[PDB]
Amino acid sequence: DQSTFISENYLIRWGSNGMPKEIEKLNNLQAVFTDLSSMDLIRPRVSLVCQIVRVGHMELKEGKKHTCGLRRPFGVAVMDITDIIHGKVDDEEKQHFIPFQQIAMETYIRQRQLIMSPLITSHVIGENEPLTSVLNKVIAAKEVNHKGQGLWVSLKLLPGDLTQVQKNFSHLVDRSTAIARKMGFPEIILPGDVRNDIYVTLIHGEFDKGKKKTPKNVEVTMSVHDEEGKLLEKAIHPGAGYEGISEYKSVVYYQVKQPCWYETVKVSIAIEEVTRCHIRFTFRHRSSQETRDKSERAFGVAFVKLMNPDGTTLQDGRHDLVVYKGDNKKMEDAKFYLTLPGTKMEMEEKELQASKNLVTFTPSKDSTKDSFQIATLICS
Numbered sequence: 001d002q003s004t005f006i007s008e009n010y011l012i013r014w015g016s017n018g019m020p021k022e023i024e025k026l027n028n029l030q031a032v033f034t035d036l037s038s039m040d041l042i043r044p045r046v047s048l049v050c051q052i053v054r055v056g057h058m059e060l061k062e063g064k065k066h067t068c069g070l071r072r073p074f075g076v077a078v079m080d081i082t083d084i085i086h087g088k089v090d091d092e093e094k095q096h097f098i099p100f101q102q103i104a105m106e107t108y109i110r111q112r113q114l115i116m117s118p119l120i121t122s123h124v125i126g127e128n129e130p131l132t133s134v135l136n137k138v139i140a141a142k143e144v145n146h147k148g149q150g151l152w153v154s155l156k157l158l159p160g161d162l163t164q165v166q167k168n169f170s171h172l173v174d175r176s177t178a179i180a181r182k183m184g185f186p187e188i189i190l191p192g193d194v195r196n197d198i199y200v201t202l203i204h205g206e207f208d209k210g211k212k213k214t215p216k217n218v219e220v221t222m223s224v225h226d227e228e229g230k231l232l233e234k235a236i237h238p239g240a241g242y243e244g245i246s247e248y249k250s251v252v253y254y255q256v257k258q259p260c261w262y263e264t265v266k267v268s269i270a271i272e273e274v275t276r277c278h279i280r281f282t283f284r285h286r287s288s289q290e291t292r293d294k295s296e297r298a299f300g301v302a303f304v305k306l307m308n309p310d311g312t313t314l315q316d317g318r319h320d321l322v323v324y325k326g327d328n329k330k331m332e333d334a335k336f337y338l339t340l341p342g343t344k345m346e347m348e349e350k351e352l353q354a355s356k357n358l359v360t361f362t363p364s365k366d367s368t369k370d371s372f373q374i375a376t377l378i379c380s
Contacts, residue, residue, distance in 0.1 A: 001045045003136075005264045007033035007180040008199065009051060009239030016056070031241055032173050034162055035182030041085055047139055048081040048098060050151050051131050053251060058217060058288040067293040070219065070252040070286050073131045075102040077150050078138035084155045092172060095154045099144030101137060103129045127254035130204075132262050161186070178241025183264065183377055196274060197379040198267040198306065198314070200236070202250050204260035205372030207283055207300060207323060215257045216285040216299070220250030220372065224267060225303070226277045229334030235277070237266035244268060252286045264375070269306070271380060274313060278305040278338065281321055281372055300324060301331045302372045303342045316377050319343045323370035340364070344371070 010031035013021035020026045040046075052074040057066035077100035083089045084096075105126035138144055156172060158165045165173050181197055200222060207218045223246065224235035237244035244266065253259035269277055280303035285296045302321035306314045320343055330336045341347040347367055354361035 001043060005183045005201070006036070006040060006043075006046070007182045007240070008197075008237075008266050009264055010178050010180050011238040011240070011242035012050075013242075028176050030173065030177035031180055032158065032162075032165055032177055033180045033182065033240075034165070035184070035186040036085065037182070037185075037187040039187065040182065041087070043085075044082070045080065046082045046085050047078045048153070048155065049135060050077045050098065050100075051135075052076060052100065052102075053131070058252065058254065058286065065290050066288060067286055067290040069249070070217070070293075071249060072127060072254060073103060073129060073134070073251055075100055076131050076135040076138055077101065077144070077146070078135060080142060081155060085157050087157060090156050092154060092156065095152050097152055098150050099138070099146035100150040101134055101141065101144045101146065102149070103127060103134055128256045130253070130256075130260040130262070131251070132260055180240035181379065183379070185379060194271070195380050196268050196271040198269065198274065199264055199375075199377055199379070200248075200267050200279060200304075201375035201377075202248075202261035202263040202265070203318065203373035203375050204258060204262070205281075205283065205302070205321070205323065205370070206258045207285075207370045208325075208368065209257070210299075214287075215255035217252050217255060217287060218250075218259055218283045219252040219286050220261065221247045221282045221284060222250065222279060223247045223282060224269065224277055224279045224306075225334060226273075227334060227338060229280070229332070229338070232269065232273075232277055235267050235269050236279075237268060239264070239266055247282075262375075274306050276307070278303055278307070278342075280304075280337075281323075281374075283323060283370075283372070297328055298331075300368070300370050301328075301337070303337060304374065305338070305342055305346075313378055313380070314376050318373060318375045319345070321372040321374060322347060323368060323372055324366055325368045325370065326366040 015021040054072045054074045077098040079098040207216050224232035231246050233246045234244040236248040250261045282298045282301045284298050300323035302323045341350050
């Protein structure tokens with residue numbers, strides 16, 4: 001109904017051999033989504049959502065090496081969990097199954113029967129679709145043509161906050177269970193609910209191809225930097241139950257002109273350290289060839305100042321980060337690009353300021369049409 005995340009995305013690393021990448025987790029893949037206010041119950045439709053992201057090569061072709069460490073959209077599995085959080089279905093034994101929808105690669109089956117009138121000019125789109133579209137589909141498509149694919153989960157709503165979760169259901173929810181905080185605030189704000197759960201939802205970003213015909217496989221390797229641009233470690237977390245990563249590499253899309261990620265991920269900086277830190281967003285064209293990938297530099301980099309110049313932290317809602325083309329060494333230096341603005345509102349302010357004072361103020365031609373969008377909801 002709301003089409004926004006209630007809690008942070010609990011990340012599960014799943015391996016390529018049928019077992020989880022974290023082999024110790026398959027028996028302990030427990031995540032409890034907390035801060036669920038009483039209004040979190042009354043939501044007319046609540047759906048449990050798993051974002052399936054294949055990490056690895058760009059293309060499944062044998063014969064030549066391909067780039068590793070690249071994330072591509074695979075699918076999303078959604079089931080109506082509205083009743084369970086409404087206190088209607090609550091039982092340990094019920095391992096509710098969430099049918100899984102993969103992006104439609106169906107371009108091989110019916111291709112063998114088309115005769116006597118071939119006039120068609122088209123191509124293959126089975127990997128370009130962002131995971132948001134599959135999410136919306138499975139939200140609409142209660143039943144999924146999952147063909148025996150999905151995630152098996154036992155779902156229980158537990159009364160109370162973390163404490164009541166732990167003191168009556170320590171068996172179900174031990175301390176090793178992953179904890180996810182609601183994207184927002186609970187109805188009871190304990191005085192001193194000290195948090196710095198800054199969340200950067202990598203909404204989308206458009207990136208110009210230039211002379212190259214193939215659309216750019218842009219990977220938003222968002223990074224958190226302070227005023228001198230040093231990489232803040234542990235700042236960005238992909239979500240719940242996962243160790244924060246200094247640079248959150250986004251989903252590398254299969255030649256998509258306007259890739260959309262909407263990757264609601266955690267950024268937990270010290271509340272005093274965020275006062276001197278920002279988040280820089282580096283974009284690299286991840287071509288299908290590994291040598292070309294490692295030889296392709298960051299064609300554009302965006303950033304965002306977590307501190308507003310008015311002594312306030314980054315505002316809630318959405319802000320359109322500006323991708324900057326030009327000298328890479330100039331864009332890798334904070335004392336240059338931080339002085340440059342990061343969002344559309346910021347360069348608009350700078351341009352209007354420079355308009356009244358025409359003293360060595362030529363508008364930077366580097367303000368390219370390439371942009372990046374983030375959704376900010378600082379729960380602090």
